[PDB]
Write a protein that binds this ligand. Structure first.
Ligand SMILES: *[C@@H]1O[C@H](CO)[C@@H](O)[C@H](O)[C@H]1NC(C)=O
Ligand SMILES: *[C@@H]1O[C@H](CO)[C@@H](O)[C@H](O)[C@H]1NC(C)=O
Lengths: 212, 214, 117
């Protein structure tokens, strides 16, 4: 079964380097050309680089020419992307993809996230969005870095009517999102509502109450 | 570089309808060395069509490709629920490989006005120097909605940030959060904080508001 | 417009040897060319043989292949040996222009080879 499994994603400060690796299983790696393709948050696909069968022909997108290097170890069945002089605009999910014998990108890896930013790893602050006087409440997940953060309500017991928004990148260089839920107003003195924030990068869990 | 322009940007169709997607090329493309990729949120793209009209393995028949030269079209003959997703065209015959910017196929459902809620800054957040005021737009359709912030009737610029949810799996609606960010000093020099929402489903812009300390 | 051209139909030799000329039309002039011959059997594609060659030098199948080939300019004449009746089918000529940029992929419409004996 054809499979591409990427690794190496992480945070980088601008100007530095990072190397992604893509591990290919399920086919004779040396008979296919490979590419990297990236997707910045919220945008479409951008082809990054191409490498021939033997590795002696490489092509690059203009936006990364002179900075990135593609290469392959056919003996280890592995594809690499060496990124140098990294810029903030290079932040994206980076996909590894295989060229079909007839041209198209027929198999794709799962993608790895690369965040290029001076900002420092930081667990989030969680503030309650208290219900006023069916009603809505939430959690403001503020100034964390980097993505991703994950929010559950009542440790998974509360799901219907939850809306965990996509994060936005503040000008502080730190991320922030909100997760809200709507609930019957009557259960507001009965039921008790906790949001569980997990930020794996900083290894921080925060549980917060929302009360009226 | 062969630039691919897809149109329309969004297709608003109801399940079971026929969807027709278009991809036009800045110059003549290879010999139909054009492919179509599908992408659902949080997943990689997957090849649907290659060579303009040949289906990748395991791709159902409802997907069909046509076109030539600079004018290509992907057709979905009857939309099943899994076909609502983003679709990219790609020219792969010459370097640089180029993609269109993508057409999003979303569920058309009946118009639904947003339920609006405003949230004052938490007391603990004030206790830390900044104040965020969150305005919620809950379960509405279509996606277009304007949010205008009004601090003591003065409407704001540059200090809010919107973020929209993906189309809800069960009822196909959207939700939006606008957050307004001030310093604590600034927040404490005004009284009335108001969120004014404009939407297709609303006869008149709904305003939710609050006063500092209530 | 990288366009590839190959015959419509070719009979194999009595000794299972079929040859066909496939030459491409290049907007630039490229120096490093890679030719691949593919078999298209309805749903699947299989790689028959490949060879890289320099513009002006000898076409050489350093594979071991059932393919030998001669290269005149923008042209390749391919010869496939050891064919048998079960090998009758459609054979795609695939050409990659690799140096200098830009890269070009051309895929031919196919050659039907009939092997009978
Ligand atoms: C291959 O088929 C296409 C599609 O009809 C055609 O336009 C093209 O000219 C053909 N090529 C040759 C060499 O006949
Ligand atoms: C192609 O090569 C075969 C191999 O001997 C030869 O017999 C044939 O005539 C050649 N044809 C052309 C057009 O070069």
């Amino acid at each position: 079964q054809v499979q591409l499994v990427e690794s190496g994603g992480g945070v980088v400060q601008p100007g530095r380097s990072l190397r992604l690796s893509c591990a290919a299983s399920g086919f004779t790696f040396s008979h296919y050309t490979m590419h990297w393709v990236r997707q910045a948050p919220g945008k479409g696909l951008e082809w990054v680089t191409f490498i021939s069968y033997d590795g002696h022909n490489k092509y690059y997108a203009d936006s990364v020419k002179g900075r990135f290097t593609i290469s392959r170890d056919n003996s280890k069945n592995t594809l690499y992307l060496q990124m140098n002089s990294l810029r903030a605009e290079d932040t994206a999910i980076y996909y590894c993809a295989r060229t079909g014998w007839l041209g198209p990108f027929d198999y794709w890896g799962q993608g790895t996230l690369v965040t290029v930013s001076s900002a420092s790893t930081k667990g989030p602050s969680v503030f309650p969005l208290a219900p006023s006087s069916t009603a809505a409440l939430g959690c403001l997940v503020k100034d964390y870095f980097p993505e991703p953060v994950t929010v559950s309500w009542n440790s998974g017991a509360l799901t219907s009517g939850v809306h965990t928004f996509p994060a936005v990148l503040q000008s502080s260089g730190l991320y922030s999102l909100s997760s809200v839920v709507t609930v019957p107003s009557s259960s507001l003195g009965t039921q008790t509502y906790i949001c569980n924030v997990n930020h794996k990068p900083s290894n921080t869990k925060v549980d917060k109450r929302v009360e009226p | 570089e062969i630039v691919l322009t897809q149109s329309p940007g969004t297709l608003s169709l109801s399940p079971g309808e026929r969807a027709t997607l278009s991809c036009r090329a800045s110059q003549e493309v290879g010999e139909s060395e054009l492919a179509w990729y599908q992408q659902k949120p949080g997943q990689a793209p997957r090849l649907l069509i290659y060579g303009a009209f040949s289906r990748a393995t395991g791709i159902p028949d409802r997907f069909s490709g046509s076109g030539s030269g600079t004018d290509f079209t992907l057709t979905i003959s009857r939309l099943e629920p899994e076909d609502f997703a983003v679709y990219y065209c790609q020219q792969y015959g010459s370097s640089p490989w180029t993609f269109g910017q993508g057409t999003k196929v979303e569920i058309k459902r009946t118009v639904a006005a947003p339920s609006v809620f405003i949230f004052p800054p938490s007391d603990e957040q004030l206790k830390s120097g900044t104040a965020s005021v969150v305005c919620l737009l809950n379960n509405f359709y279509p996606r277009e909605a304007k949010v205008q912030w009004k601090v003591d009737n003065a409407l704001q610029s540059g200090n809010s940030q919107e973020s929209v949810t993906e189309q809800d799996s069960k009822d196909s609606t959207y939700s939006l959060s606008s957050t307004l960010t001030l310093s604590k000093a600034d927040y404490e020099k005004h009284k009335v904080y108001a969120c004014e929402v404009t939407h297709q489903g609303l006869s008149s812009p709904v305003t939710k508001s609050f006063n500092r300390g209530e | 417009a990288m366009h590839v051209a190959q015959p419509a139909v070719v009979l194999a030799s009595s000794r299972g040897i079929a040859s066909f000329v496939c030459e491409y039309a290049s907007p630039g002039k490229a120096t490093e060319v890679r030719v691949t011959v593919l078999r298209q059997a309805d749903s699947q594609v299989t790689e028959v043989c490949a060879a890289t060659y320099m513009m002006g030098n000898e076409l050489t199948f350093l594979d071991d292949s059932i393919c030998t080939g001669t290269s005149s300019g923008n042209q390749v004449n391919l010869t496939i040996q050891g064919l048998r009746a079960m090998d009758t089918g459609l054979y795609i000529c695939k050409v990659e222009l690799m140096y200098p940029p830009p890269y070009y992929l051309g895929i031919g419409n196919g050659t039907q080879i009939y092997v009978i004996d």
